[PDB]
Structure 1
Amino acid sequence: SGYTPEEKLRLQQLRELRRRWLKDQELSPREPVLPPQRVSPVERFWNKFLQDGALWKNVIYKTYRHSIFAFTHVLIPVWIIHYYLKYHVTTKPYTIVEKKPRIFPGDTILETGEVIPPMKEFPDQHH
């Protein structure tokens, strides 16, 4: 059942071509030939500063990355939202409805100073 002499010859003829083909599918040291991609001043400055390991200046670098992220993603949006909610949404009826705060027996109200009676005495229990 093994390969006939012609079958095995053809495989070797092709097997040499495929190995040659797969060898051609390799990138030369220059490739890919990227265009003259300029680098912004921030990019180049950090590269020099990040040359040495200097663990002490990587926490600072991490802080800088998070500081910028926390500014353009958590601080500017909240300004826009707070400005939006405070001066456009809250100016219309029932746009923002908050459940009334729970009042417990024996509290003090900030709006009027009312002091609700504490409670009726309990039939003291144990356990």
Structure 2
Amino acid sequence: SGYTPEEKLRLQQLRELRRRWLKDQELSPREPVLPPQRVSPVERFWNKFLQDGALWKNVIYKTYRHSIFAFTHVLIPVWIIHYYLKYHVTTKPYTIVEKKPRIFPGDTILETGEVIPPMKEFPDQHH
């Protein structure tokens, strides 16, 4: 109860066009024809400085990538944040409210110099 002769031909005829079409869906070696692209000298130095494998120098290359990221994305923002916090946020009352440090027995205060007497003798035992 398979295909009637017409159906077998039509499917064959369709597949003949179908696979021709799918072959047209391939890019020639020259594609895409990207417009001319400017390459910065800083990029040129790395492409020429890396070239071959030279795994030893990649650590220098990676350190450059991390140093750049650790500078623009960490050091610069913490300057902006710190300047904002130190001279603008903290000049107004109760903008940053800390929790007063815990004071344990037998400690001296840096500011006032007070000493808190230790606790009473412990009637403790071994174990």
Specify the TM-score bucket, using the shorter chain as the normaliser: over 0.9
Identity of aligned residues (%): 100
Offset at residue 119 of structure 1 (A): 1.1
SS at match of 2:36: coil
> Residue by residue, what CA displacement relative to the aligned partner does 1:17-48 show, whole Å, maximum 9, x if unpaired?
01000000000111000000110011111101
Unaligned runs of 5+ in 2: none
> Residue by residue, what CA displacement relative to the aligned partner does 1:46-91 show, whole Å, maximum 9, x if unpaired?
1011111111100000000000000000000000000000000000
SS at match of 1:37: coil
C-alpha distance in structure 1 between counterparts of 2:43 and 2:11, whole Å: 53
Does residue 7 of structure 1 match 2:4? Answer: no
Structure 2 counterpart of 1:36: 36
Structure 2 counterpart of 1:95: 95
TM value normalised by structure 1: 0.98
SS at match of 1:90: helix
1 or 2, which has the higher helix percentage?
A: 2
RMSD over aligned Cα, in angstroms?
0.6
Structure 1: 4+ residue segments shifted above 6 A:
none
TM value normalised by structure 2: 0.98
C-alpha distance in structure 2 between counterparts of 1:51 and 1:14, whole Å: 50
